[PDB]
Ligand binder design. Structure first.
Ligand code: MN
Ligand code: MN
Length: 222
């Protein structure tokens, strides 16, 4: 099943950021926008650190030097897949060892119990145990269709409802992935969708804990 990492000792301030997609400049602005204090705050990404943006490599190296955490996104996953096969193609041919190593160690889910939060790239199946989730679902789901009784799907043309509307907690699940829907806040405090489309010219948003307040900055203009 999907790999889970638990951080019981993280009781300080926690910053969770949406899809970065190589928008390093934007990430720097967001860090200044929340007054990030290295050594004090803990940073956690929702995945999709690469592709589309101007600097995929810088994004990953910045997070590395900062000691930042991140779950695995589906673009990160597809890149690793393409690479192991000794526009992800151009990226696969140019990916350096360190970057590849950082991505290769990312879990699918991160639990931050002190703040009653759970991070996954796309979402969690509301009918499966946290430790018994599936990789394809946790990194690509957008919808849930009634048919153990719900089917998770990345497509939106087969009906169903947005997965987050079906989440019941008790944990607050923070995610990204679904740029088509933008920032999702109507399910607070049980869930928070942070993919505000930074790389598409929207915004780069973050959820701050304790509190669960959303702080964002302008996205990449292209
Ligand atoms: Mn994405
Ligand atoms: Mn994604």
């Amino acid at each position: 099943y999907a790999n889970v990492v638990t951080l019981p000792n993280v009781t300080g301030r926690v910053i969770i950021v949406g899809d970065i997609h190589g928008c390093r400049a934007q990430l720097e602005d967001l860090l200044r926008a929340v007054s990030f204090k290295q050594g004090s705050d803990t940073l956690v990404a929702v995945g999709d650190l690469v592709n589309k943006g101007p600097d995929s490599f810088g994004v990953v190296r910045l997070l590395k030097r900062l000691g930042a955490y991140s779950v695995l996104g589906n673009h990160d996953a597809k890149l690793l897949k393409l690479v192991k096969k000794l526009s992800l193609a151009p990226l696969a041919q140019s990916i350096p060892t360190d970057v590849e190593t950082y991505l290769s160690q990312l879990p699918h889910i991160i639990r931050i119990p002190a703040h009653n939060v759970m991070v996954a790239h796309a979402g969690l199946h509301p009918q499966r145990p946290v430790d018994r989730q599936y990789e394809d679902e946790v990194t690509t789901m957008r919808n849930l269709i009634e048919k153990v009784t719900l089917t998770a799907t990345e497509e939106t043309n087969d009906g169903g409802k947005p997965w987050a509307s079906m989440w019941r907690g008790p944990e607050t699940v923070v995610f990204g992935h679904d740029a088509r829907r933008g920032l999702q806040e109507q399910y607070k405090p049980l869930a928070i969708g942070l993919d505000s489309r930074c790389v598409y010219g929207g915004r780069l948003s973050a959820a701050v804990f304790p509190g669960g307040c959303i702080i964002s900055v302008p996205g990449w203009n292209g």
